[PDB]
């Protein structure tokens, strides 16, 4: 089983590390055929990236001819490219996809999944929501559950910022520490303006609720520079009717002690209501989400 | 695929109902070959139980010759019988097991699972811990996770009792309402003396941590008749060293607002710490745990 690793930022690097450390006994026939960044194409599995040739991800795809693409490249919410057209080509060629990049799915979920379904192609996408805390994969172990509504804190970066700000840390310093820890999107405004949280609730609305929705039609906003009296959280919500993201005051609520980089998800089904909580961001966490998807794919359980 | 339903109390009945209601599209070739209670053996799938013959579960097993046994019979913590010897016979004959009954696993986990592993037999046991709230199956979507420690509220009945008692309800009235709702073990003392919670932490220690442990060596105790000043919870805990159950005062703690029949589980791994919470007991909830295991077995994902 040959992987093409698309992206080698903090998640890509942590994924390669986790694969090597957790190789036995299920992942021995899984090889990284090649790694692609903006810098070019490495046709090796090495810790340090060195291009063997220049070329984009499509050249790398044609060269490596992989069984699976691991998409750990950065978000593009304008048109989802190049990931979007890459997913289309891969599915058409019967190549499986594991992604931590939310952009293609938040824009064209129903199209991507119907394309993959017709081809018998599998898509792992746990890393797109709450990183390594089962969300997508939590739903996989809730078969036959009819999801009525969902609510939660889905952005690690802004939650970490708000938490630090009440420990006497300035906005700019909080953001810089979030970036230092590698919590933030490459474009940190995607966290700040609520684009990232909006992408995640879109994905969840599509997958869990069955509401066919693009990020383009989701009403959302982010956090502020400003406080002190109440506890603010960025709340994402979806039911069969509405999908939104908005900062809100939270009463001394199940989402109240969800602090630092921690995220949480409340799922209401026909059967019951459940809540899961864990780290929402963190390169190792996100990479573990992708690794979980890989092991599950190996087990034929995606 | 032919099921033998062993037990037809509230869980058994809710399981049969859920199977019929969630039949499409994955479960159409799943039939209940027969149902066995203390009253005898019905060789039909009917809502109302009527014996077609007298005989125990072994007679029913020989008569039906099932692909899977669904064990929703009552707990026996003395020796785990008849379920224990039934599991042995079933595994030997290559028959899969789905159980909500904790007793055999809490007594002979390592033996049962090594027997099944050698035979390629699958065991679903989600319903044994936190009913329909992924616990066992949550771990299934955490592959490669090394579980360091676990802590939680694992008994629905006692948690419901404590909650009602602060709404001006007496112990006896709280217990009677727990029984009315069908939360309690057939022997309600199993809830009260902490046997049920102890069974669940034993199962989890075995499956998640890898600590080979029987309930016989777990130090445990239950709730009291007595309060008023603090919030008491029955806390179960396991790490690589110790396994225990004890009532404790809980500070205004992640397990603090876990009230009524709700249960919760804190899992600490090499990667991260996560918490899941949902109803811990409830016939429909437990039966859904078993149904989840059935769908996963159908998908070859147990
Ligand atoms: N960083 C994290 O912890 C998380 C990351 N995410 C996603 O994981 C993905 C990767 O993250 P990260 O490692 O930080 O990547 P980073 O953006 O730092 O680097 C992207 C990599 O892709 C390559 N690349 C980008 N565009 C390319 C193009 N057009 N052609 C060729 N190569 C290209 C770059 O060269 C680089 O190697 C992103 O899509 C994230 O959105 C997934 C789980 C989390 S959620 C984080 C969120 N900010 C929050 O606070 O909730
Ligand atoms: N009831 C619930 O909501 C839950 C049930 N559990 C387990 O599910 C199992 C069944 O529960 P329930 O429907 O209430 O069963 P119940 O005990 O009411 O009836 C048992 C059935 O098995 C049959 N049976 C028992 N022994 C037999 C024998 N030797 N030969 C032939 N037939 C026999 C009986 O005739 C009867 O039909 C039990 O093992 C429970 O421990 C699983 C999830 C929950 S956890 C509940 C726990 N008390 C708590 O508060 O946390």
Author numbering:
A (entry chain A), B (entry chain A): 1 to 226, 228 to 253, 255 to 304
The paper states:
Within the aspartate pathway to threonine, methionine and isoleucine synthesis, homoserine dehydrogenase (HSD) functions in the third reaction step – i.e., NAD(P)H-dependent production of homoserine from L-aspartate-4-semialdehyde. We previously reported that the HSD from the hyperthermophilic archaeon Sulfolobus tokodaii (StHSD) is activated by reductive cleavage of the disulfide bond formed between cysteine residues (Cys304) in the C-terminal regions of the homodimer subunits. The crystal structure revealed that StHSD is composed of a nucleotide-binding region (residues 1–130 and 285–304), a dimerization region (residues 131–145 and 256–284), and a catalytic region (residues 146–255). In the present study, we discovered the marked inhibition of StHSD by cysteine and present structural evidence that a cysteine binds at the active site of StHSD in complex with NAD.
